Amino acid sequence: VARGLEGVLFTESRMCYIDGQQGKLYYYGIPIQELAEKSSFEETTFLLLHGRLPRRQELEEFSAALARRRALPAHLLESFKRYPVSAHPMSFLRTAVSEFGMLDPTEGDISREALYEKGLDLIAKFATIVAANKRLKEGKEPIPPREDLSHAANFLYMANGVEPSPEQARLMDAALILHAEHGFNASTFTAIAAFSTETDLYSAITAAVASLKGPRHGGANEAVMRMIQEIGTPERAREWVREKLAKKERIMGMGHRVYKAFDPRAGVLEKLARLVAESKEYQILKIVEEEAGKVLNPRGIYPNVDFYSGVVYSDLGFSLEFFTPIFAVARISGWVGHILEYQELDNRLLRPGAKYVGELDVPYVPLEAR
Amino acid sequence: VARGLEGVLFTESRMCYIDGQQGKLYYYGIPIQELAEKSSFEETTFLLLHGRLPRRQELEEFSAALARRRALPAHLLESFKRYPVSAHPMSFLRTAVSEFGMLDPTEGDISREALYEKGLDLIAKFATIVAANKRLKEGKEPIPPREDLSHAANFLYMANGVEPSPEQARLMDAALILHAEHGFNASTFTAIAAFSTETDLYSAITAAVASLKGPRHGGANEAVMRMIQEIGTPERAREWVREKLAKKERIMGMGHRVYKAFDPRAGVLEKLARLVAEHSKEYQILKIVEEEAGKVLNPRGIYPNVDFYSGVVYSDLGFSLEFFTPIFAVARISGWVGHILEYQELDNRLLRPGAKYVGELDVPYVPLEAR
Numbered sequence: 021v022a023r024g025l026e027g028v029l030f031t032e033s034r035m036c037y038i039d040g041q042q043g044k045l046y047y048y049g050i051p052i053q054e055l056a057e058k059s060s061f062e063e064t065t066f067l068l069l070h071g072r073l074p075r076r077q078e079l080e081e082f083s084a085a086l087a088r089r090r091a092l093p094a095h096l097l098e099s100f101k102r103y104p105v106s107a108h109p110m111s112f113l114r115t116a117v118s119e120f121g122m123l124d125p126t127e128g129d130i131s132r133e134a135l136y137e138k139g140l141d142l143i144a145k146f147a148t149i150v151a152a153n154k155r156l157k158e159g160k161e162p163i164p165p166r167e168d169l170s171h172a173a174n175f176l177y178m179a180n181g182v183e184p185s186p187e188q189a190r191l192m193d194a195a196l197i198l199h200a201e202h203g204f205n206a207s208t209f210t211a212i213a214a215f216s217t218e219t220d221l222y223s224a225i226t227a228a229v230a231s232l233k234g235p236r237h238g239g240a241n242e243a244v245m246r247m248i249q250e251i252g253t254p255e256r257a258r259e260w261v262r263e264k265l266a267k268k269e270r271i272m273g274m275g276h277r278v279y280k281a282f283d284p285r286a287g288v289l290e291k292l293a294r295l296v297a298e299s300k301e302y303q304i305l306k307i308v309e310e311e312a313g314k315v316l317n318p319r320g321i322y323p324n325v326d327f328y329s330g331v332v333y334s335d336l337g338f339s340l341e342f343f344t345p346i347f348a349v350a351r352i353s354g355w356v357g358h359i360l361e362y363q364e365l366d367n368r369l370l371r372p373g374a375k376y377v378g379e380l381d382v383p384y385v386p387l388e389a390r
Numbered sequence: 391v392a393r394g395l396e397g398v399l400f401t402e403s404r405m406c407y408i409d410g411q412q413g414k415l416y417y418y419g420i421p422i423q424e425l426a427e428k429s430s431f432e433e434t435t436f437l438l439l440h441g442r443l444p445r446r447q448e449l450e451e452f453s454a455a456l457a458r459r460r461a462l463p464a465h466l467l468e469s470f471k472r473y474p475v476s477a478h479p480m481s482f483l484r485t486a487v488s489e490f491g492m493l494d495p496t497e498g499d500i501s502r503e504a505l506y507e508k509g510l511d512l513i514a515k516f517a518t519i520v521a522a523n524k525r526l527k528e529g530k531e532p533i534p535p536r537e538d539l540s541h542a543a544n545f546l547y548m549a550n551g552v553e554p555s556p557e558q559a560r561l562m563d564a565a566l567i568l569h570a571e572h573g574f575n576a577s578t579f580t581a582i583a584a585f586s587t588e589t590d591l592y593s594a595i596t597a598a599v600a601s602l603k604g605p606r607h608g609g610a611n612e613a614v615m616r617m618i619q620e621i622g623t624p625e626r627a628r629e630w631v632r633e634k635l636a637k638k639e640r641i642m643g644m645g646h647r648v649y650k651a652f653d654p655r656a657g658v659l660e661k662l663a664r665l666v667a668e669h670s671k672e673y674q675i676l677k678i679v680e681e682e683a684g685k686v687l688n689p690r691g692i693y694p695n696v697d698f699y700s701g702v703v704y705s706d707l708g709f710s711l712e713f714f715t716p717i718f719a720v721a722r723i724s725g726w727v728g729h730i731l732e733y734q735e736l737d738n739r740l741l742r743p744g745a746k747y748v749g750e751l752d753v754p755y756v757p758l759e760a761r
């Protein structure tokens with residue numbers, strides 16, 4: 021029984037190579053550290069959708085293309101007004117994508133060209149949705165996209181109401197790149213499971229968002245921040261971990277189905293977190309990292325991408341309930357890419373089985389005789 | 391590489407046994423034919439969630455518990471008014487479930503009891519959502535659930551605007567029972583994939599609905615009716631079949647990923663389709679297709695599946711093709727909930743597979759200027 025589908029390779033992919041032992045990550049063969057440093061969200065999105073780095077003009081046009089698609093339709097923006105503002109942002113996002121799906125007169129079209137076109141709209145619009153949610157949570161009005169800003173800069177602008185510093189934008193740009201793609205993780209896999217029935221892109225992405233929301237998965241984002249707050253001070257971190265591990269509970273932001281080593285994305289984020297810190301949250305994380313590490317590292321359990329990302333998002337102006345949506349704002353590129361690849365390379369309905377451990381030939385006992 | 395995850399057994403389950411070789415189905419050990427004859431959607435639901443038949447008081451209380459959860463909140467009914475009427479019914483449902491979860495103050499509570507309780511709410515409300523969708527599709531107003539009607543009778547009532555005859559209610563009830571549960575099919579598996587991240591129930595069910603929306607899952611229903619229509623009359627059924635197979639094109643409503651024999655649910659539906667048939671045209675075309683296509687396909691292990699006869703049953707109950715999959719969801723939500731409860735109980739592990747990597751490694755980041 022392949023519990024958790026661990027070790028099950030169900031398809032072939034060119035998109036993401038994860039070396040869990042050595043802790044390497046590549047997007048179509050390019051190391052993530054290279055991309056985080058040098059690339060942008062648009063460029064990495066092109067890479068993930070097209071399978072190669074864009075040329076100058078391609079990138080310029082691809083970015084303008086995405087930018088032109090950032091705005092949400094009035095209908096959806098009107099709908100947001102009654103979206104329960106106390107609802108979790110991932111549930112906001114989940115609903116927005118589904119509703120957006122209804123507004124598409126050709127929603128069901130899944131030709132490669134339509135997936136790509138609808139995907140460009142989702143990749144572009146996700147930031148606008150999450151930002152709108154954030155503005156609404158704050159009792160303020162959603163802000164229209166500024167097409168002149170990069171995706172990252174625009175996301176910050178719509179979320180915060182002011183154009184970000186170039187540094188702030190670069191930080192957001194780095195974070196998006198780091199979360200953009202990561203193989204057949206739970207949310208990507210869920211999207212493919214859904215898509216494997218030839219359902220529409222919105223259905224597959226709603227499912228992906230649904231999946232990403234979980235605290236075992238992308239929800240570990242805010243969970244780690246919850247952990248930091250619960251700890252409160254770096255002075256309480258060690259004993260906190262000691263007793264957390266003593267009651268055999270899990271330390272959020274550590275451990276990974278694949279990485280049995282420091283997450284190469286966490287490695288990058290740790291450095292960005294360190295720069296923002298220069299700081300209690302970061303100090304607390306380092307202590308948790310050290311203290312939990314000494315029992316978990318030997319088990320192959322290390323900080324993952326969710327461990328340091330919150331420090332980063334928090335610096336960018338986001339409260340913790342938006343950490344996972346920010347994740348989604350990036351990962352949508354990877355989801356669309358995977359849906360395009362799965363269609364091309366495999367496109368088979370996923371229909372697994374289980375090991376039945378129940379009973380057979382149980383009688384239907386007459387009601388009055390039970 | 392395990393394409394399609396075929397033969398991949400990723401968890402243990404007690405809920406559903408699918409005998410693919412002999413064409414047998416059981417919900418917690420009970421043959422599907424028994425439940426289709428004797429049980430009810432509420433009782434079978436109880437079975438699917440509790441793993442056993444309910445005592446008389448239990449069922450009565452359970453039925454009532456579901457009945458008082460049928461009504462949708464005014465907030466959601468109001469939102470429906472702006473849902474695009476031209477939208478796909480499954481997109482309506484997908485959105486409805488998602489928006490409903492937003493109205494739940496403890497949406498993310500996934501303790502067993504909270505899953506059970508929220509699952510009952512979804513089971514009860516799925517019929518009310520799909521029925522509202524249908525009313526709205528017709529430019530009409532949703533109809534409030536009636537507690538004095540069973541789940542099936544009420545569904546027809548809310549959907550059609552008139553209380554169904556006992557016969558029609560019995561047909562629907564039997565149809566819901568038959569589609570309530572079927573192992574780790576795409577929608578159920580996708581529910582689990584989602585839920586394995588410990589996301590909320592609505593997220594998992596929204597994902598289930600997203601999967602079910604696909605034509606490769608729960609769809610054939612419509613395709614069979616299209617087939618029947620393109621055949622037109624039983625007089626040209628055999629010929630159509632012979633030509634269809636010669637085109638090496640598939641015959642809708644036959645063949646199954648697991649069933650390499652007659653679908654036991656098709657076995658029950660075949661008798662029910664014949665009941666509604668006694669417009670016998672639909673049915674007669676189907677029996678001729680079954681026979682002519684079966685003489686060729688049966689030996690290859692392909693037989694009619696649940697989708698072969700269900701369409702005839704649903705359109706007779708007043709549902710257009712596009713509501714076939716929603717009606718499927720109205721029943722399967724019981725199994726989805728049951729599976730989420732079981733998965734949590736028995737396994738509860740993150741679903742995180744891998745892929746065989748056939749890409750490049752150590753690709754340099756070439757400068758923009760040099761590309």
Ligand SMILES: CC(C)(COP(=O)(O)OP(=O)(O)OC[C@H]1O[C@@H](n2cnc3c(N)ncnc32)[C@H](O)[C@@H]1OP(=O)(O)O)[C@@H](O)C(=O)NCCC(=O)NCCS
Binds near residue numbers: 024271324326739
């Ligand atoms: C991601 C995660 C689900 C991967 O786990 P998995 O591959 O599905 O494996 P399992 O959950 O079955 O666990 C393996 C063992 O490691 C332990 N373990 C896993 N991650 C752990 C963590 N973060 N804290 C402490 N113990 C942990 C488990 O308790 C388990 O114990 P056992 O064999 O002693 O019973 C898991 O590491 C986790 O829950 N991490 C916290 C959430 C998180 O940060 N998720 C984001 C991943 S990027």
Ligand SMILES: CC(C)(COP(=O)(O)OP(=O)(O)OC[C@H]1O[C@@H](n2cnc3c(N)ncnc32)[C@H](O)[C@@H]1OP(=O)(O)O)[C@@H](O)C(=O)NCCC(=O)NCCS
Binds near residue numbers: 609642644645
């Ligand atoms: C469910 C389904 C996908 C299973 O396909 P499968 O796993 O490839 O089926 P088998 O493994 O038993 O197939 C062996 C052969 O029978 C053919 N076959 C099976 N389904 C067929 C159908 N309904 N009509 C004609 N031929 C069919 C296959 O195409 C295959 O091709 P080959 O001679 O080229 O190798 C297929 O039966 C189908 O598309 N059904 C029609 C629609 C339908 O009713 N399905 C929905 C409910 S599951």
